[PDB]
Design a binder for this molecule. Structure first.
Ligand code: 3GP
Length: 329
């Protein structure tokens, strides 16, 4: 009768908008249960061949499906009340470009509240199986350390941290609920890769995985807002250059492109960023997911909605010193 309990707290503003997703599909807002499931496939998947079939077998065997009951019961409870959103703060705090789609929804009045930094949430994992309560907790751990939840969370919203917990599974694995140093970060990542393999038993894949991903940090900043604002300056220059670039390519003079001297040269990979707390101080966190399946830079929708790609790392690392936490690449 296993049970893991956690209290997580927002580091950056968190927008949980599952509700808007039926009318507006641009408003993808992954929940905690949602994002845990994702991170599981990115831990496990570091061990499966390009064997999507088997990964789906294990994934459904843990989290459940339409033809299966879950072996783990994930209970999430807000402990804070949503606060009224202050549209004045995007100009004031210099987050006007990264969180543009939020400000837009705010001004239209589609959203009026949000969980501001400090909001707490209780997550409680229960399972009769030990193999399962270990995999579920690594997923939650991965979510907090490398991921995010909510609308625009791959751009700094929904960054989380653990403030109190009662985990017999992290104790067992020799893991922490916080990072006192960067070396702690590095070591735990390594540890999570190794332990995940064993629990399961026993050439790059098509899906995103933790094994094949770069993780970088920088700072510390004075506060969380100073970090976010750095991303916002960097993104703005990215966006300026990007717009100029794609009007050249798509609508300018027709030119015949040359095949790259290296296979899959212009296939740039997804990049999420956020805010991690290391030693009590705020760091910018960046993660790049390298895989084989393709993802076009070019989608039918406004270019301020286009996914940020790995070629963005320049616009941070050329402007302030960056530290590599995880080098798989
Ligand atoms: N953990 C996490 N996953 C996300 C976030 N945004 C999108 N995703 C997941 O990653 C993918 C990025 O588009 C999405 O589809 P996918 O499930 O097909 O991989 C989604 O499930 C996020 O902010 N956090």
């Amino acid at each position: 009768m296993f049970i893991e309990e956690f209290e997580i707290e927002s580091i950056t503003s968190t927008h949980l908008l599952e509700v808007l997703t039926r009318e507006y599909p641009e408003v993808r807002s992954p929940s905690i249960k949602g994002a845990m499931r994702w991170w599981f496939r990115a831990l496990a998947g570091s061990y499966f061949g390009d064997d999507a079939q088997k990964l789906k077998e294990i994934e459904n065997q843990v989290f459940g499906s339409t033809k299966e009951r879950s072996r783990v019961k994930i209970s999430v409870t807000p402990l804070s009340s949503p606060k009224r959103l202050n549209l004045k703060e995007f100009k004031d705090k210099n987050v006007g470009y990264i969180w543009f789609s939020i400000n837009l929804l705010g001004k239209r009045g589609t959203i009026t509240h949000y969980y501001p930094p400090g909001s707490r949430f209780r997550v409680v994992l229960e399972s009769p199986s030990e193999r399962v309560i270990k995999l579920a907790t690594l997923s939650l751990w991965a979510l907090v350390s490398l991921g995010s939840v909510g609308f625009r969370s791959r751009r700094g919203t929904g960054s989380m941290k653990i403030v109190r917990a009662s985990s017999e599974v992290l104790e067992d694995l020799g893991l922490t609920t916080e990072f006192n140093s960067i070396d702690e970060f590095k070591d735990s990542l390594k540890r999570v890769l190794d332990v995940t393999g064993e629990i399961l038993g026993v050439s790059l894949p098509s899906y995103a995985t933790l094994k094949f991903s770069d993780v970088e940090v920088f700072g510390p900043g004075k506060n969380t807002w100073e970090v976010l604002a750095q991303f916002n300056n960097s993104y703005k220059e990215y966006l300026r250059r990007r717009i100029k670039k794609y009007q050249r390519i798509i609508f300018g003079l027709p030119r015949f492109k040359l095949r790259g001297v290296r296979k899959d040269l212009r296939r740039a990979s997804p990049l999420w960023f956020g805010v991690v707390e290391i030693g009590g101080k705020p760091y910018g966190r960046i993660i790049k997911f390298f895989q084989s399946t393709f993802h076009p830079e070019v989608r039918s929708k406004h270019i301020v909605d286009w996914n940020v790609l790995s070629n963005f790392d320049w616009f941070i690392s050329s402007r302030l010193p960056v530290t590599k936490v995880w080098g798989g690449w």
